Amino acid sequence: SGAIYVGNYRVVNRHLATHNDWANLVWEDSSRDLLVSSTTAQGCDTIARCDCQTGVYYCSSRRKHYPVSFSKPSLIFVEASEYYPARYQSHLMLAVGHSEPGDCGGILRCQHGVVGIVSTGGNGLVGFADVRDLLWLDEE
Ligand SMILES: O=C1CN(C(=O)COc2ccccc2)CCN1
Ligand SMILES: O=C1CN(C(=O)COc2ccccc2)CCN1
Numbered sequence: 001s002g003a004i005y006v007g008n009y010r011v012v013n014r015h016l017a018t019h020n021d022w023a024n025l026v027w028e029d030s031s032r033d034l035l036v037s038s039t040t041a042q043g044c045d046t047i048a049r050c051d052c053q054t055g056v057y058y059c060s061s062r063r064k065h066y067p068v069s070f071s072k073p074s075l076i077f078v079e080a081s082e083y084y085p086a087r088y089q090s091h092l093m094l095a096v097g098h099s100e101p102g103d104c105g106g107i108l109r110c111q112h113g114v115v116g117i118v119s120t121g122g123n124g125l126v127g128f129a130d131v132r133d134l135l136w137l138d139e140e
């Protein structure tokens with residue numbers, strides 16, 4: 001689990017969004033596994049605006065932050081998981097590391113702020129749903 005809190009937005013994995021998320025929907029994209037809902041209180045996170053390929057992510061199934069190198073956001077085939085069929089996921093970044101289903105929502109961050117959230121796992125990789133192209137998260 002986990003979310004990004006930027007201004008009056010909550011960014012979560014689409015597959016973990018609550019009824020309250022969907023009832024307060026700003027934007028959602030199944031292909032990216034992302035959903036954004038509205039908040040009352042302002043959030044503590046800043047979104048990275050950059051093309052960094054190195055950063056640190058939080059892994060709940062290890063209670064640890066890991067430094068990783070990761071691929072640029074691309075359209076990637078993902079093997080079936082507990083929460084999705086085998087399918088193509090877009091805007092996805094891969095790194096070598098540990099990721100289980102419960103790790104979804106862990107933040108990947110760089111020097112410029114939050115890059116993305118954990119979205120995929122298995123076969124010794126961790127995948128992150130990028131948010132750095134969502135410039136609209138920074139206003140309104
Ligand atoms: O037992 C299972 C079966 N799996 C699946 O059902 C894959 O599809 C989905 C589809 C919809 C919702 C959640 C998961 C993955 C591996 N474990
Ligand atoms: O303390 C941390 C962890 N962080 C997170 O991403 C928390 O996310 C997860 C994912 C699943 C459940 C609970 C937490 C922020 C930076 N360091």
Ligand SMILES: [Zn+2]
Nearest residue numbers: 050052110112
């Ligand atoms: Zn960066």
